[PDB]
Amino acid sequence: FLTAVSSIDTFLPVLNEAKLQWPTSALAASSEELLGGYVGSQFYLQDGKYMQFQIAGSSNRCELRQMIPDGGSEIGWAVDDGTTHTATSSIVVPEQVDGVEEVTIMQIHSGEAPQLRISWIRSKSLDGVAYEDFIMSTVRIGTGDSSDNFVKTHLADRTAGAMSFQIDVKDSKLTITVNGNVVVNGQDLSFWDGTDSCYFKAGAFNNNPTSESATARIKFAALAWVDH
Ligand SMILES: O=C(O)[C@H]1O[C@@H](O[C@H]2[C@H](O)[C@H](O)[C@H](O[C@H]3[C@H](O)[C@H](O)[C@H](O[C@H]4[C@H](O)[C@H](O)[C@H](O[C@H]5[C@H](O)[C@H](O)[C@H](O[C@H]6[C@H](O)[C@H](O)[C@H](O)O[C@@H]6C(=O)O)O[C@@H]5C(=O)O)O[C@@H]4C(=O)O)O[C@@H]3C(=O)O)O[C@@H]2C(=O)O)[C@@H](O)[C@@H](O)[C@@H]1O
C-alpha cells in the first residue's frame, strides 16, 4: 500500500480537525480514519513528507474539510467573533498536466458559498492584465455570478519550490500572506456578517478542466487550522 499521511507526525494536528471529502463533497474518511492510516492514490504521503491530493473530473475534489477537534462534527464559525481564525500552509504546486486549468487549494466556505478560494490557474486576465501559471485569490463579496461579486487577486506566480500561505480572518477582515509577505491586507468580509457556518478547506478541488480525465495534483508540506 501507499504510505499513509498519518504515518508521520507532521499532519496529525490538522487531521484531528478534518474529514476528507473525495471524490465529491461526499465523505471519504472521518477524522479518526485519517489519523488511523486512511490512504489511497488520491491521498498519500509523498516523498516521505508531503500530504498529496490528486483528483480528476469537473468540480471533483480531494479536500480536507474543517471539523470540530477530537472527533467532533462539522464546525462553523463567524468572520467577526473577535478571534482570529487562521489557516497556514506550505504547498508545492507542481506543473499541472494538460487539461487541468484551475485547482483550488485552500478555501473559506460556509453553508451557502465560498468566501475565499486560493487557486492555481493556468491563465487568466485580472483587471485588464494577463497572468499565466499563478496563484490567485477569489473573494466573494456577493452571492451572484457577475464580476462585482468577486475580488480576484494575483497572489504570486507559481514556484517550483514550496510556497507558504497564511489566511487570517479577524473582525470581518481577511489577510493573506504569501511566503511571509502580506499580499491581501484586510479585504472586507462584512457581506458575510451574521453567518455562523464558515469553515476552512484545503486540498485539491478541480475547476473547469478541459479534460475529465486530467488529474490535478497538489502537495502540502504543512497545513494547520487554528483559532487565536
Ligand atoms: O469559473 C467561473 O465560472 C466562476 O467560478 C467562481 O468560483 C466558483 C468555483 O469555480 C467553483 O465552482 C466553486 O464551487 C463551490 C460550489 O459552488 C459549492 O459552493 C460547493 O459547496 C460544497 C462545499 O464545498 C462542501 O463540500 C459541502 O459539503 C457538504 C456536503 O454537500 C454535504 O452537505 C454534507 O452532508 C453531510 C454532513 O455530515 C452534514 O452535516 C449532514 O449533517 O450529514 C451529511 C452526511 O452525512 O451525508 O455536509 C458537507 C459539509 O461538510 O458541509 O457541499 C457543497 C456542495 O454543494 O457540494 O463548494 C464549491 C467549492 O468547494 O468552492 O464555486 C465558486 C463560486 O461560486 O464562487 C468564481 O471564480 C467566478 O469568478 C468565476 O467566474
UniProtKB/TrEMBL annotation:
InterPro entries noted in UniProt: Alginate_lyase_2, ConA-like_dom_sf
Keywords of the record: Lyase, Signal
Gene3D superfamilies: 2.60.120.200
Gene Ontology molecular function terms on file: lyase activity
Domain Alginate lyase: 17-223
Protein name: Alginate lyase
Organism encoding this protein: Paradendryphiella salina
Upper classification of the organism: Eukaryota, Fungi, Dikarya, Ascomycota, Pezizomycotina
